[PDB]
Design an enzyme around this catalytic site. Structure first.
Site, mmCIF file in Angstrom:
data_model
loop_
_atom_site.group_PDB
_atom_site.id
_atom_site.type_symbol
_atom_site.label_atom_id
_atom_site.label_comp_id
_atom_site.label_asym_id
_atom_site.label_seq_id
_atom_site.Cartn_x
_atom_site.Cartn_y
_atom_site.Cartn_z
ATOM 1 N N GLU A 13 0.679 -1.376 0.168
ATOM 2 C CA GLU A 13 -0.154 -0.484 0.193
ATOM 3 C C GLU A 13 0.772 1.663 -0.209
ATOM 4 O O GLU A 13 0.504 2.140 0.290
ATOM 5 C CB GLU A 13 -1.076 0.194 1.444
ATOM 6 N N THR A 18 0.397 2.754 -7.874
ATOM 7 C CA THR A 18 -0.933 3.899 -8.454
ATOM 8 C C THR A 18 0.999 4.672 -10.057
ATOM 9 O O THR A 18 0.574 5.364 -10.556
ATOM 10 C CB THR A 18 -1.215 5.234 -7.442
ATOM 11 N N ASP A 169 7.710 -3.102 -10.707
ATOM 12 C CA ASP A 169 6.591 -3.382 -9.870
ATOM 13 C C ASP A 169 6.334 -4.499 -9.000
ATOM 14 O O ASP A 169 6.473 -5.604 -9.828
ATOM 15 C CB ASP A 169 5.026 -3.229 -10.110
ATOM 16 N N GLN A 173 3.451 -6.980 0.746
ATOM 17 C CA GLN A 173 3.439 -7.142 1.520
ATOM 18 C C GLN A 173 5.211 -8.383 1.943
ATOM 19 O O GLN A 173 5.760 -8.505 1.421
ATOM 20 C CB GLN A 173 2.396 -8.862 1.716
HETATM 21 N N1 LIG Z 1 -4.502 9.344 -1.967
HETATM 22 C C1 LIG Z 1 -3.827 9.369 -2.841
HETATM 23 N N2 LIG Z 1 -3.992 7.950 -2.456
HETATM 24 C C2 LIG Z 1 -2.656 7.045 -2.983
HETATM 25 C C3 LIG Z 1 -1.242 7.863 -3.145
HETATM 26 N N3 LIG Z 1 -0.434 6.974 -3.495
HETATM 27 C C4 LIG Z 1 -1.385 5.694 -3.968
HETATM 28 N N4 LIG Z 1 -2.232 5.804 -3.290
HETATM 29 C C5 LIG Z 1 -4.147 5.362 -3.739
HETATM 30 O O1 LIG Z 1 -3.592 4.447 -1.928
HETATM 31 C C6 LIG Z 1 -3.730 2.918 -2.665
HETATM 32 C C7 LIG Z 1 -2.761 2.186 -2.738
HETATM 33 O O2 LIG Z 1 -1.403 2.405 -3.284
HETATM 34 P P1 LIG Z 1 -0.947 1.121 -4.697
HETATM 35 O O3 LIG Z 1 -0.521 1.794 -5.533
HETATM 36 O O4 LIG Z 1 -2.161 -0.158 -5.014
HETATM 37 O O5 LIG Z 1 -0.117 0.451 -3.609
HETATM 38 P P2 LIG Z 1 1.008 -0.578 -3.825
HETATM 39 O O6 LIG Z 1 0.973 -0.706 -5.618
HETATM 40 O O7 LIG Z 1 1.201 -1.987 -2.760
HETATM 41 O O8 LIG Z 1 2.466 -0.006 -3.338
HETATM 42 C C8 LIG Z 1 -4.924 3.122 -4.265
HETATM 43 O O9 LIG Z 1 -6.087 3.060 -3.959
HETATM 44 C C9 LIG Z 1 -4.358 4.440 -4.306
HETATM 45 O O10 LIG Z 1 -5.004 5.401 -5.238
HETATM 46 C C10 LIG Z 1 -1.164 9.397 -2.623
HETATM 47 O O11 LIG Z 1 -0.116 9.743 -2.926
HETATM 48 N N5 LIG Z 1 -2.164 10.229 -2.675
HETATM 49 F F1 ALF Z 2 -1.144 -3.839 -4.178
HETATM 50 AL AL1 ALF Z 2 0.559 -3.556 -3.089
HETATM 51 F F2 ALF Z 2 2.608 -3.747 -1.904
HETATM 52 F F3 ALF Z 2 0.042 -4.039 -1.386
HETATM 53 F F4 ALF Z 2 1.507 -3.843 -4.808
HETATM 54 MG MG LIG Z 3 0.665 -3.243 -6.255
#
Ligand SMILES: Nc1nc2c(ncn2[C@@H]2O[C@H](COP(=O)(O)OP(=O)(O)O)[C@@H](O)[C@H]2O)c(=O)[nH]1
Ligand code: ALF
Ligand SMILES: [Mg+2]
Lengths: 314, 134
Positions: A13, A18, A169, A173
């Site tokens: 997260e 993103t 990417d 976790q």
């Molecule tokens: N408001 C806001 N939301 C964010 C930001 N970065 C990510 N998100 C949101 O946080 C959630 C998790 O981001 P994600 O890119 O899926 O996480 P990861 O790939 O597991 O690192 C998603 O719903 C994104 O839209 C940010 O800088 N601002």
């Molecule tokens: F959805 Al993740 F690191 F929690 F890409």
């Molecule tokens: Mg992700």
């Protein structure tokens, strides 16, 4: 044909996926009207999943509903299998609008750090009429906001005119991390993401462990790896927008008692966090480049990419 | 008459839904090949191991098979640890002490979900999949 490999690393997260979406918008094929329709069901599902979390939290935390009619709505909404959701219709629309309005649920939301709730909840829940519209079409911003957990390791090439960027990417976790070894070779540069707003949260993976302590430990590990001694390291302190909100109600000193700056001050808070990270390897004289980011803000991310490419990689 | 190409049809069918894909033997195999290039095939292995565990008849076999599957995919530090949350992991551990046919339903669900929303859509945009359409 000139090609560079860049890792996106960070705990779960943090906003890694993103960043990829923003690359796609700024340097790739973007999101067509048709592409956006593919996100409709996920938007719906994020909404149901978020409300279900709050509903179960109402019990776990023992918070009463303020309006009696909302109990029936909660029963209704809790019984839904989110996997089989494909439309967003009454009575479900009105149940959720009505639940979101209950001061009880609002307390529950304000206490979201004590359970697990996806960051884009408020953004969707405040806009249910737009989303409920029979002929709703997700905006680019809805797409950037959607939560889909990443598993495994994935390469996205993007052609910037002068060079190809090979972005990787990864899932964030704990269990996912054992796989990272598969992308550690020939890395030009690392973009390490940390969620500024994760200071009061705990990991989904485990029992009651602070999310920011976890990012520190991880960052420290990465920095010390000798095969990265010549890879440039960029620390994006992401979610700075959520920090602006959260800092008004959740005090940093209650989680990191070394913070001696003012309360309710996003800027001092984020400077302290940055400082904590930079202070993890006092024996390294390796450079850390940082920037405060909002991953869902295209303009913000456009800048951050131009600067890495124009300054750091040349 | 109207021409339809058997391989084009087969591959198209896989895009109707993930549950459709999983019922196509050649769908599963294409998808598995894909997972392996993303290092996330343990998700599919786990899922398959659960479908099979549901088929078990002997209670004797059931008990030790639940332990194998848990030791293999679920526990922290498991050699093929699947990405799930603490609660699902722990609910599974509880289930394990009086094991039944539903022992992994919660965990199999999360993993199903993980594949369905993340890997599956990317597979449908993969060159490997798209080449089978034209
Ligand atoms: N408001 C806001 N939301 C964010 C930001 N970065 C990510 N998100 C949101 O946080 C959630 C998790 O981001 P994600 O890119 O899926 O996480 P990861 O790939 O597991 O690192 C998603 O719903 C994104 O839209 C940010 O800088 N601002
Ligand atoms: F959805 Al993740 F690191 F929690 F890409
Ligand atoms: Mg992700």
């Amino acid at each position: 044909r000139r090609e560079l490999k860049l890792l996106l690393l960070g705990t779960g997260e943090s906003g890694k996926s993103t960043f990829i979406k923003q690359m796609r918008i700024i340097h790739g094929s973007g999101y067509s009207d048709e592409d956006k329709r593919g996100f409709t069901k996920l938007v719906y599902q994020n909404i149901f999943t978020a409300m279900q979390a709050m509903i179960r939290a109402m019990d776990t935390l023992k918070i009463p509903y303020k309006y009696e009619h909302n109990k029936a709505h909660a029963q209704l909404v809790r019984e839904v299998d989110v996997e089989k959701v494909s439309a967003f219709e009454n009575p479900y629309v009105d149940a959720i609008k009505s639940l979101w309005n209950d001061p009880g649920i609002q307390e529950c939301y304000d206490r979201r750090r004590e359970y697990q709730l996806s960051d884009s909840t408020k953004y969707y829940l405040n806009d249910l009429d737009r989303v409920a519209d029979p002929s709703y079409l997700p905006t680019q911003q809805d797409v950037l906001r959607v939560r889909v957990p990443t598993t495994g390791i994935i390469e996205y090439p993007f052609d910037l005119q002068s060079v190809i960027f090979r972005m990787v990417d990864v899932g964030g976790q704990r269990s996912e991390r054992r796989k990272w070894i598969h992308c550690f070779e020939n890395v030009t540069s690392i973009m390490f993401l940390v969620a500024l707003s994760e200071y009061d949260q705990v990991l989904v993976e485990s029992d009651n462990e602070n999310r920011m302590e976890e990012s520190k430990a991880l960052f420290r590990t990465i920095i010390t790896y000798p095969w990265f001694q010549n890879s440039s390291v960029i620390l994006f302190l992401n979610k700075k927008d959520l920090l602006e909100e959260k800092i008004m109600y959740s005090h940093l000193v209650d989680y990191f008692p070394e913070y001696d700056g003012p309360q309710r001050d996003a800027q001092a808070a984020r400077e302290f966090i940055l400082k904590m990270f930079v202070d993890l390897n006092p024996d390294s004289d390796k450079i850390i480049y940082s920037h405060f980011t909002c991953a869902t803000d295209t303009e913000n991310i456009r800048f951050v990419f131009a600067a890495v490419k124009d300054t750091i990689l040349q | 008459s109207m021409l339809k190409r058997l391989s084009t049809e087969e591959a198209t069918r896989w895009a109707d839904s993930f549950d459709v894909l999983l019922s196509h033997k050649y769908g599963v195999a294409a998808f598995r090949a894909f997972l392996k290039t993303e290092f996330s095939e343990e998700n599919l292995e786990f899922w398959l191991a659960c479908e099979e565990f549901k088929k078990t008849r002997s209670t004797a076999k059931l008990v030790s098979k639940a332990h194998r599957i848990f030791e293999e995919f679920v526990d922290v530090q498991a050699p093929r640890e699947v990405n799930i949350d603490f609660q699902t992991r722990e609910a599974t551990r509880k289930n394990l002490q009086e094991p039944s046919l539903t022992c992994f339903d919660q965990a199999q669900g999360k993993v199903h979900s993980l594949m369905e929303k993340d890997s599956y859509p990317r597979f449908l945009r993969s060159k490997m999949y798209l080449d089978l359409l034209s």
